[PDB]
Structure formats: C-alpha cells, structure tokens
Amino acid sequence: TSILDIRQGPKEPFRDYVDRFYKTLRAEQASQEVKNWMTETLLVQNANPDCKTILKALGPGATLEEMMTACQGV
Amino acid sequence: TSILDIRQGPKEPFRDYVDRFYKTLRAEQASQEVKNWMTETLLVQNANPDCKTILKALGPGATLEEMMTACQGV
Amino acid sequence: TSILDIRQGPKEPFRDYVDRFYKTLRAEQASQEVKNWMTETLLVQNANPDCKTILKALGPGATLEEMMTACQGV
Amino acid sequence: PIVQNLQGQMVHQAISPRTLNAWVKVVEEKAFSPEVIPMFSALSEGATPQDLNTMLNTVGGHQAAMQMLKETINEEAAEWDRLHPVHAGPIAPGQMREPRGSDIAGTTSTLQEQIGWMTHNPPIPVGEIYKRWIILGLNKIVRMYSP
Amino acid sequence: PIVQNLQGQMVHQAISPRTLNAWVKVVEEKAFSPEVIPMFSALSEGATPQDLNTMLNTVGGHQAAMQMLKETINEEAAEWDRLHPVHAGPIAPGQMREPRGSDIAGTTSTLQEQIGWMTHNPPIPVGEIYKRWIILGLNKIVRMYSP
Amino acid sequence: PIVQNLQGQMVHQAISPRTLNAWVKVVEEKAFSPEVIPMFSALSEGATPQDLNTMLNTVGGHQAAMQMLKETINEEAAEWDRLHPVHAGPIAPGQMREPRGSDIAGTTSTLQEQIGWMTHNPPIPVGEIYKRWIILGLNKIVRMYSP
Numbered sequence: 001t002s003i004l005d006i007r008q009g010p011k012e013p014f015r016d017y018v019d020r021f022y023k024t025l026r027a028e029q030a031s032q033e034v035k036n037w038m039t040e041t042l043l044v045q046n047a048n049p050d051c052k053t054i055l056k057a058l059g060p061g062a063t064l065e066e067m068m069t070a071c072q073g074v
Numbered sequence: 075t076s077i078l079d080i081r082q083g084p085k086e087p088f089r090d091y092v093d094r095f096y097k098t099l100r101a102e103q104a105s106q107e108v109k110n111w112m113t114e115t116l117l118v119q120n121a122n123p124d125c126k127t128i129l130k131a132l133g134p135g136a137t138l139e140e141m142m143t144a145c146q147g148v
Numbered sequence: 149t150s151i152l153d154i155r156q157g158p159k160e161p162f163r164d165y166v167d168r169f170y171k172t173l174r175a176e177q178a179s180q181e182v183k184n185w186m187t188e189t190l191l192v193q194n195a196n197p198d199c200k201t202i203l204k205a206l207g208p209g210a211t212l213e214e215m216m217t218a219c220q221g222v
Numbered sequence: 223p224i225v226q227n228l229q230g231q232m233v234h235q236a237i238s239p240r241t242l243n244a245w246v247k248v249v250e251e252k253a254f255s256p257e258v259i260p261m262f263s264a265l266s267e268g269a270t271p272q273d274l275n276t277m278l279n280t281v282g283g284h285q286a287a288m289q290m291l292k293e294t295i296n297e298e299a300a301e302w303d304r305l306h307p308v309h310a311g312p313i314a315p316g317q318m319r320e321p322r323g324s325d326i327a328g329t330t331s332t333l334q335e336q337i338g339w340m341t342h343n344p345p346i347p348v349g350e351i352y353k354r355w356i357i358l359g360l361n362k363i364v365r366m367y368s369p
Numbered sequence: 370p371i372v373q374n375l376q377g378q379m380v381h382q383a384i385s386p387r388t389l390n391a392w393v394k395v396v397e398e399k400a401f402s403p404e405v406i407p408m409f410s411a412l413s414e415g416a417t418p419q420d421l422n423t424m425l426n427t428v429g430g431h432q433a434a435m436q437m438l439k440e441t442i443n444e445e446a447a448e449w450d451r452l453h454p455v456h457a458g459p460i461a462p463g464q465m466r467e468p469r470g471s472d473i474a475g476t477t478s479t480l481q482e483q484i485g486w487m488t489h490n491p492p493i494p495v496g497e498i499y500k501r502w503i504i505l506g507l508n509k510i511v512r513m514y515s516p
Numbered sequence: 517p518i519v520q521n522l523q524g525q526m527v528h529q530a531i532s533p534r535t536l537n538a539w540v541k542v543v544e545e546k547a548f549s550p551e552v553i554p555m556f557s558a559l560s561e562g563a564t565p566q567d568l569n570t571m572l573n574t575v576g577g578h579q580a581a582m583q584m585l586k587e588t589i590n591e592e593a594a595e596w597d598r599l600h601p602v603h604a605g606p607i608a609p610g611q612m613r614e615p616r617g618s619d620i621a622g623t624t625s626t627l628q629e630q631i632g633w634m635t636h637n638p639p640i641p642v643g644e645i646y647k648r649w650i651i652l653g654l655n656k657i658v659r660m661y662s663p
C-alpha cells in the first residue's frame with residue numbers, strides 16, 4: 001500500500017490513523033526533509049473533516065502530543 | 075483517564091476501587107505532600123454512600139488495612 | 149476467613165477438612181503452644197457428629213495418621 | 223546482587239532476566255499465598271536494596287497491597303531512624319557514614335555506597351534489615367488477604 | 370553491552386536473544402504500562418547507545434508513540450548541544466573528542482568510540498544521559514496514554 | 517561466527533540452535549515486515565559469509581523473494597568485481613589473496629580463508645559488505661511487498 005492511500009476513516013480515531021501513518025512512513029526510505037514535508041502535509045490532508053477542522057485551530061508549530069490530545073473526542 | 079474521574083460504583087467493592095486509585099495515583103507524578111493530600115481527600119470523597127458512611131465512623135488517623143477491613147461487607 | 153470459621157461438612161471427608169485446617173493454621177502466626185492448643189481442641193470440636201463420635205473413641209494421645217485412618221469410612 | 227567472584231572477592235553482578243521473570247510469574251500465579259515468602263527469600267539471596275526496589279517497582283496489579291507495603295516499609299524505616307540516632311560529631315575521613323532508614327530502603331544511598339557497607343569489614347546487613355520489613359509487611363498482607 | 374571480563378577489564382559482549390525476546394514480550398504484553406520503565410532500566414544495565422537504538426528500532430506497532438519518542442530523543446539531543454557548546458580550538462592528539470547529542474543518540478558515533486568514552490578514565494555516562502531522555506519520553510507517553 | 521576468546525584472541529565458534537530457531541521464528545512471524553532488518557542485524561553480529569548463506573539457505577517459503585534476493589546478491593557481487601579489479605601480477609608468498617564478489621558471498625572462499633581476512637591486520641569487513649547487500653536487497657523486498 002502507498003503512503004497517499006493512507007487516510008482517516010469517518011469513525012476512525014486519529015490515533016489509530018497516526019499509527020498507520022508512521023508505520024507506512026517507516027516503509028518509506030526518502031530524505032528526511034521530504035519525510036518532514038510528508039508529515040506536515042499529508043497527515044492533516046487525509047485526516048477526517050471533524051478532526052481536520054480541530055487541527056486547523058491548533059495552527060502551525062504544533063507537536064504530536066498536542067495533536068493527539070487535540071483530536072481525542074472526535 | 076484523570077484521577078478525579080476515579081470513583082466507586084454503587085455495587086463495587088471498595089477494595090476494587092482502592093486498587094484503581096493507587097494504579098492511577100501510580101501514573102501521577104506530583105510532589106509527595108500533594109499525593110498525601112489526594113490520599114486523605116479524594117479516596118473518601120469518591121467512595122460510595124454506604125462505605126462513605128462507614129469511613130466517616132473510622133475518624134481520622136485511620137490506616138489502609140483498617141479502612142479495607144472496615145468496608146468489607148458493603 | 150478466620151480459623152474458628154473452619155468446620156467439617158456433614159458429607160465432607162475429614163481428610164479434606166484437615167487439609168483446610170493446616171492451610172488456615174499455616175496463615176496463623178501465634179506461639180507454638182497456642183497452635184498446639186488449637187490442634188487438639190478446635191479440629192475435633194468442628195469435626196462432624198459421625199466422625200466426632202469416632203474420634204472420641206480414639207482417646208487422647210492420638211496422632212494424625214491414626215485419626216486420618218480412623219475417620220476414613222465416614 | 224553482590225556475589226563472590228572466582229578470584230575470592232565480593233563483586234556486584236546483575237540479576238538474571240529469567241530470575242526477574244520467575245519473580246514476576248510467582249506473583250502472577252500465587253498472588254498473596256504464603257509460599258510467596260520462602261520463594262522471595264530464596265530469590266533475594268545476596269540481593270541489594272536497589273534490587274529489592276526493582277522487584278517491588280516491577281509489580282503490576284494488587285496496588286492496594288503495594289501501597290500498604292510501601293507505607294509499612296516507610297514505617298519500619300521511620301522506626302530505624304528513631305531507634306538508631308545519628309552519631310556524635312562530623313564524619314571521619316578514614317570512615318564511611320552510618321546508614322539511615324532511607325539508605326536501607328535504598329532511596330538515599332547509591333550502589334557503590336550499598337556495596338561499601340556490605341563488603342567492608344565489619345559488614346552491615348542492610349539487605350537483611352529491609353528483608354525483615356518486607357517479610358513483616360508480607361505477614362500484614364497475608365493476614366489481611368486471608369478471607 | 371560493555372561488561373567486566375574475568376581478567377578485570379571492561380570489554381564489549383553482545384546482548385542475548387532471550388534478553389532481546391524478553392524486551393519484545395514486555396512491549397507486547399504491557400504496552401505503555403508504568404512497569405515497562407523499571408523493566409527497561411534493568412534490561413538496559415550496562416547497555417550502549419547502539420544497543421538502545423537496536424531496542425527502539427526493533428519495536429513493532431505503537432508507531433505514533435515511537436514517533437513521539439524519536440522527536441523527544443532529538444529534542445533532548447538538541448538541548449544537549451545547546452547546553453554544552455563545542456570546546457576551544459582543535460582536538461588534541463593525546464585525547465579523544467567530546468560527544469554531541471547525536472553521539473549520545475549513537476548516530477554519529479561508532480561502537481569503538483562509545484567504548485572509548487565509557488571505558489576511558491574519567492568515564493562519561495552517555496548511556497545514562499540517553500536513559501534519562503528515554504525515561505523522560507516514557508513519562509510523556511505514559512501521561513498521554515493514560516485514558 | 518568469529519568471537520573473541522577469554523585469552524584475548526579472535527577465534528571461530530559455532531552459532532547456537534536457539535539463535536538459529538530465533539532466526540527461523542522471526543521469519544515465520546513477521547515475514548517481510550521492517551523489524552526484520554534491525555533483528556537480522558543484531559543476530560548477524562560477528563557473523564561469517566558462510567553463516568549468512570546458512571541463514572538464507574535455511575529459509576522455507578517466500579521463494580519469489582528468496583530468488584529476488586539471490587539475484588540482488590549476485591548483482592551486488594558482480595558490481596564488487598567490476599569496481600575492484602584484480603591486482604597487479606602474481607600473489608606474494610608472504611601475503612594472502614584479495615577477495616572477489618563470490619568470496620564475499622562466501623561461495624569461493626573457505627572458512628579458514630574467511631577467518632584469515634577478518635582476523636588479519638588490517639582486517640577486511642567482508643561481513644559488512646555482504647550485510648549492506650542483504651540490507652539493500654531487504655529494502656527492495658520491503659518496497660515491493662508493501663501493498
């Protein structure tokens with residue numbers, strides 16, 4: 001399965017999705033800079049509308065514990 | 075789960091509740107003095123009315139074997 | 149469970165009862181002299197009428213193999 | 223633990239994983255049963271305070287009991303400090319310091335310090351003092367957890 | 370790990386498969402539970418950075434946590450470099466170089482280099498510095514993964 | 517593998533059955549998963565080419581992958597021979613011969629020859645060259661076997 005095919009379900013907790021992401025990211029072998037680009041970009045983009053909304057409110061500069069606690073009720 | 079969310083059921087033995095308390099207390103990292111405050115306070119407060127009644131009769135100065143044997147029939 | 153609460157059933161073999169007794173006696177921490185007193189006293193006292201009758205016929209001075217073989221058919 | 227080497231000196235060696243796991247498995251299987259105390263005693267042969275906190279801290283489950291024990295260990299430690307007052311004047315350069323309840327509990331002492339006390343001549347049996355507190359606290363538990 | 374040989378010197382020896390598997394099994398069974406930290410600590414006794422990356426890299430599952438830890442290890446490493454600046458002028462022929470955050474993380478250093486620092490006199494405890502970062506990052510995880 | 521003996525020399529010792537079986541079990545359980553590569557790397561510590569063919573030859577199943585790897589090992593070996601030409605004139609009596617791709621793959625060399633190269637001064641890391649080919653070929657597999 002390709003990294004672009006990794007997406008969050010409509011009922012799937014973000015948490016279970018983030019695990020899937022760094023597992024697939026774990027099978028990507030690209031430069032770190034590209035993998036940083038993938039992190040800030042693709043993760044949010046394939047996140048579900050309800051959490052996506054939430055993550056837009058965190059702004060930039062956000063870290064994984066704060067994202068992970070931010071989308072917990074969703 | 076937060077330590078404030080730890081409470082005793084209406085049919086739950088105190089014993090099973092006290093185990094839950096020092097497990098969650100085991101995941102709190104606060105100063106010992108604060109954790110002493112939590113011990114004497116929160117434990118009794120979220121204890122059920124029937125045992126709560128019992129524990130009020132033990133008075134202060136009470137230790138865990140005496141609390142644990144005190145609420146056994148409840 | 150307390151040692152006073154250890155008693156022989158009406159259909160329970162003595163043997164299964166004597167095992168229960170020295171298990172609970174195993175969780176008593178009292179002086180040896182007191183535990184000797186418990187041995188000669190409480191064991192027979194909470195023994196069932198049919199075996200109790202049998203044990204009264206062994207008299208005093210009796211040892212465990214002779215008690216255990218004495219109440220075998222009961 | 224502190225064990226004797228082939229050369230004929232007492233040196234520290236680490237405790238083994240299948241020893242660790244055997245401690246875990248005992249607790250899993252026999253919980254508060256009395257056989258736990260001789261068992262403990264055998265597996266604590268030549269053990270440090272540090273290793274004894276490791277064994278207590280690595281428990282999962284039975285947290286009411288684990289707290290009762292802790293509180294017994296501190297009571298027994300408070301009692302050590304009471305019974306044995308600190309000694310007269312400053313500590314000698316030629317000597318090493320007397321332990322407190324918390325050094326016996328392993329808390330305020332370092333490993334090298336725990337090895338100093340035990341290996342030195344006369345040796346002081348800080349393991350065996352903690353061991354009695356553990357066994358005493360084990361009796362408390364056993365007696366309570368009888369049904 | 371780096372262990373003491375019978376001869377009385379510190380030499381490197383490899384970690385054992387049933388030690389490896391015991392690390393695996395702990396993670397399988399107790400996931401983020403607190404008992405994992407003393408457990409880790411015992412199994413990390415005398416361990417290298419290199420062995421510590423081996424243990425972290427051999428995890429399967431819990432990849433959100435594994436990424437959070439990585440990022441904590443790099444933050445703590447960035448902080449090592451900040452707090453301890455590089456030293457004045459060129460490196461002496463008679464001496465060996467001071468570590469950076471990435472040498473502590475094992476990344477920029479080789480094994481023989483990791484053995485130089487630890488075995489040399491004075492020794493520097495690059496294991497124990499990484500160990501705190503691991504334990505600190507373990508607290509972060511434990512606190513988050515509480516429900 | 518080639519290990520250091522107590523006397524302070526490098527000697528060959530055989531690999532252990534529960535090491536062998538642990539290699540088998542990893543492959544059984546985690547197939548093409550990435551954790552296989554650090555795992556491999558740990559269990560290949562101090563290993564010979566001969567031991568590395570033993571490990572590859574003892575696989576059952578996943579024969580399409582095993583063939584892809586073989587063919588990668590030969591490609592990487594062909595590349596070794598290309599990049600490193602044979603040296604000028606006859607081999608010296610005082611010296612031992614330079615390896616080819618097939619000596620690195622273990623095929624044309626004997627064990628005593630594999631021990632000569634590694635134990636000699638300077639030593640040549642023919643394990644680590646094969647190891648990269650294995651890891652490289654492991655990446656090929658992992659990338660393909662991603663779904």
